[PDB]
Structures are given as C-alpha cells and as structure tokens.
C-alpha cells in the first residue's frame, strides 16, 4: 500500500531534517521500502530544466517570463512523475518528495501572482488527479528562511526575490493548506525538537489511520 509523501516550505524551512524525522518515524513503524525525489530535478531532463530555472543568468540578460517559469516547473514535474514517482508507487515503493505541485501553487501563484484558476487547470491538464497522499508544509518566517539560505551560500534566481515575494508565497502555502486536510501545516518557527515532534506525531497518526 505505497504512498507519496511530500514536504513543503520556503527555502530555509529545513525540509531535509524534516525528511530524516519522517524516515525514522516510518521505519519505526515498519515502513522501509522508499525512494526520494526532489523538485525541480530528479531526471536528466528535470535537472536541465532545474538549471534554466534556478541558475543566475541561466539565459544571460533575458528575464524568464512568469508563465515560462510555470511551464518549465510543470515539464520537470510531469517528467519526474511519469518516469520515476508513479512507477515506484506502482512497484510498492513509497516515495518521499522534497517539493511537488504545492510549490508551484505557492510560488508562482502567491509569489508571482499567476491566477489560481489557471494554475488549477494546468495541474489538472498536466497531472490529472495524481496527488501526494500526505503533505507536510513546514511553516517558517520569510526572514528566517532567507537568513538560512544566505548562510548556506549563493542564492538561486528565485531566492534572490523580495521579502514581499516570500511573504506572499508563505501566505498562499497556508491558504492552500487550509483547504486540504491531507496537507498539514507544521509550525517550523519552533525549536528543532518541538518541530521534530510535531512531524513524528502527524506522521504516526496518519499512518495509524491508514
Ligand atoms: C518545485 C518548485 C520550486 N520553486 C522554487 C522553490 C525554491 O525557491 C526554488 C529552488 O528550489 P530548491 O528546493 O531546489 O532549492 P534548495 O536550495 O534545495 O532549497 P530547499 O527548498 O530544499 O531548502 P530546505 O530549507 O528544505 O533545505 P535544508 O537542506 O533542510 O536546509 C537549507 C539550509 O538551511 C539550514 N537550516 C535548516 N533548518 C535550520 C534550522 N532549524 N536552524 C538553522 N539552519 C537551518 C540548513 O543548515 C541548510 O544550510 O524553486 C518554485 O518556484 N516552484 C516550484 O514548483
């Protein structure tokens, strides 16, 4: 009974540390066959798209249009979904993703301002009814996420955005999470141990209810 779990949040939200907790939890619950995926990326094509999308001046001085941005995130996503994720799930292997469609809804929807209706029809046109079985949205303030991204190194094209861009993106993450009960909003502005605990119980409960 394979499942697709996705972790979401701004850069700097600590999604890898969150995945470590998710893995430990699942393992303690006897769930051990799983593979990881990260978006944008995960296949030769997705990795090339990832570079065009994030590398500073990937296309010189030309500015990538918001819609071209949206469509490349979707090209990378569907490539990954169809050639990696689905087959893994069809094989009984669980899949834990670092970002998925919610990222597009929050960043291109909230941060860029692309119409939600449009994003919805794109998602349906491209992915149909495929959705993650559980999503863990790690909520962190924009200032803390950015501080962490900068401490890490050079900022990608999107992370170089304004505070207002991240502010809008965060809000839309919450807004979308509020309308889907399978998307849990985890308070990640709390100390690490508190965060890790929230994740562990949420996951444990969801699995028990499986
Ligand atoms: C899929 C998609 C993405 N995007 C945007 C989202 C992004 O802005 C950008 C690049 O996306 P990317 O995720 O590949 O970029 P990454 O560099 O991988 O960023 P992540 O989103 O994976 O960051 P995380 O914060 O989860 O990663 P983690 O490795 O856990 O931590 C990042 C750094 O923060 C520190 N950190 C983490 N937690 C910390 C804590 N509690 N205290 C202190 N520091 C902490 C870590 O030490 C590390 O340096 O693309 C869209 O616009 N639309 C889409 O559809």
Swiss-Prot record:
Keywords: ATP-binding, Kinase, Nucleotide biosynthesis, Nucleotide-binding, Transferase. The keyword Nucleotide-binding applies. It catalyses: dTMP + ATP = dTDP + ADP. InterPro entries: P-loop_NTPase, Thymidylate_kin-like_dom, Thymidylate_kin_CS, Thymidylate_kinase. It is an enzyme of class 2 (transferase). SUPFAM superfamilies: P-loop containing nucleoside triphosphate hydrolases (SSF52540). The record marks 152 as: Transition state stabilizer. CDD domains: TMPK (cd01672). DTMP binds at residues 11, 73, 77, 99, 104, 107-108. It comes from the Bacteria. Pathway: Pyrimidine metabolism; dTTP biosynthesis. Its EC number is 2.7.4.9. Residues 146-158 are annotated as: LID. PROSITE patterns: THYMIDYLATE_KINASE. GO terms for cellular component: cytoplasm; cytosol. Catalyzes the reversible phosphorylation of deoxythymidine monophosphate (dTMP) to deoxythymidine diphosphate (dTDP), using ATP as its preferred phosphoryl donor. Situated at the junction of both de novo and salvage pathways of deoxythymidine triphosphate (dTTP) synthesis, is essential for DNA synthesis and cellular growth. NCBIfam families: DTMP_kinase. Belongs to the thymidylate kinase family. The LID domain is a solvent-exposed domain that closes over the site of phosphoryl transfer upon ATP binding. Homodimer. This is Thymidylate kinase.
């Amino acid at each position: 009974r394979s499942k697709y779990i996705v972790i979401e949040g701004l850069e700097g939200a600590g999604k890898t540390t969150a995945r470590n907790v998710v893995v430990e939890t699942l393992e303690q619950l006897g769930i051990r066959d799983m593979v990881f995926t990260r978006e944008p990326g995960g296949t030769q094509l997705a990795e090339k798209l990832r570079s065009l999308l994030l590398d500073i001046k990937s296309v010189g001085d030309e500015v990538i249009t918001d819609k071209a941005e949206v469509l490349m995130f979707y090209a990378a996503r569907v490539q990954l979904v169809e050639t990696v994720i689905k087959p893994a799930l069809a094989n009984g292997t669980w899949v834990i993703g670092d970002r998925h469609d919610l990222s597009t809804q929050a960043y291109q929807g909230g941060g860029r301002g692309i119409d939600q209706h449009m994003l919805a029809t794109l998602r349906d046109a491209v992915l149909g009814d495929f959705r993650p079985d559980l999503t863990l949205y790690l909520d962190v303030t924009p200032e803390v996420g950015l501080k962490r991204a900068r401490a890490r190194g050079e900022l990608d094209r999107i992370e170089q955005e304004s505070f207002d861009f991240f502010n809008r993106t965060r809000a839309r993450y919450l807004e979308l999470a509020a309308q889907d009960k399978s998307i849990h909003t985890i308070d990640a502005t709390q100390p690490l141990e508190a965060v890790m605990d929230a994740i562990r119980t949420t996951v444990t409960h969801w699995v028990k209810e499986l």
